[PDB]
């Protein structure tokens, strides 16, 4: 079948390798996944040494982390926005590692108001929490490049998993000069 050996390539001198022995199972490959975007569906692949991989087909949502605040939250993926391998991957709405996507940002608006008391269920709050917010508010600040995004309810993020391998779509928000990189890029 598909093979991963080197017996078919050319030598560095340009010569042609003569092949003795038949094909072996240890170097087999398999057809890719081409993970789309939609309702979740997976298939079990029996790997080497027992085990199983989650071939992800049309995943829908995943866990997106917030590095600066050391937090994570479950959010939905709206659409893929950027890819670096090819433009054709964006059009087909495929999911692979390091894609640039957009997420709802409604849950993150909930976390920020709960954690800090700033809303972009707040008046109802005990006096202990009503004094803790000012403590965090004193020694923590936020950037306009992300304050504006939360107001608009649409956040840019990047995938950080292998959907055709682990069957998930995890990621992290874009902050700092990296975010300004893609903002100019779009």
Question: Contact with Mg ion (CB under 5 A): which of 35, 55, 59, 62?
Answer: 62
Within 10 A of 108 (CB to CB), how many other CB atoms are there?
A: 23
169 binding Mg ion? (CB under 5 A): yes
CB of 26 to RNA, least distance (A): 4
Question: 3-state SS of the chain: helix, strand, coil percent to 5?
Answer: 25, 25, 45
Q: Does 164 engage in binding with Mg ion (CB under 5 A)?
A: no
Q: What number of chain residues touch RNA (CB under 7 A)?
A: 87
124 bridge partner residues: none
Mark 65-94 with x for binding to RNA (rule: CB under 7 A) and - for no binding.
xxx--xxxxx---------xxxxx--x---
- The nearest distance, CB 108 to RNA, in angstroms, is 11
169 labeled binding residue: yes
Is residue 83 helix, strand or coil?
coil
Indicate whether 49 belongs to the interface with RNA (CB under 7 A).
yes
Question: Which residues within the stretch 151-170 sit at the binding site for RNA (CB under 7 A)?
Answer: 160-168, 170
DSSP conformational letter for 15? P
**Residues near 85 by Cβ (< 8 Å), separated by ≥ 6?**
96
Residue 103 CB partners (closer than 8 Å, separation 6+) = 64, 75, 76, 77, 78, 154, 155, 156, 157
What is the DSSP secondary structure assignment for residue 59, as one 8-state letter? B
Binding of RNA by 100 (CB under 7 A): no
CB of 56 to Mg ion, least distance (A): 12
- The reply to whether 60 sits near RNA by the rule CB under 7 A is no
155 in contact with Mg ion (CB under 5 A): no
Annotated binding site: 64, 169
Q: Which residues make up the interface to Mg ion (CB under 5 A)? A: 62, 169, 171
């Amino acid at each position: 079948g598909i093979v991963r050996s080197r017996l078919h390539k050319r030598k560095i001198t340009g010569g042609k390798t003569k092949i003795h022995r038949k094909r072996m199972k240890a170097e087999l490959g398999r057809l890719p996944a081409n993970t789309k975007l939609g309702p979740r569906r997976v298939s079990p692949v029996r790997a080497r040494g027992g085990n199983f991989k989650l071939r992800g087909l049309r995943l829908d949502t995943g866990n997106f982390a917030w590095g600066t605040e050391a937090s994570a939250q479950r959010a939905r993926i709206l659409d893929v926005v950027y890819n670096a391998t090819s433009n054709e991957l964006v059009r087909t709405k495929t999911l692979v590692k390091n894609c640039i996507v957009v997420v709802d940002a409604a849950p993150f608006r909930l976390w920020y108001a709960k954690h800090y008391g700033i809303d972009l269920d707040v008046k109802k709050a005990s006096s202990k929490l009503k004094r803790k917010w000012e403590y965090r508010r004193k020694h923590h600040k936020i950037e306009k490049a992300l304050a504006d995004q939360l107001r608009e309810g649409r956040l840019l993020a990047r995938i950080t998993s292998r959907p055709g391998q682990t069957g998930r779509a995890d990621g992290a928000l874009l902050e700092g000069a990296e975010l300004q990189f893609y903002l100019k890029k779009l």
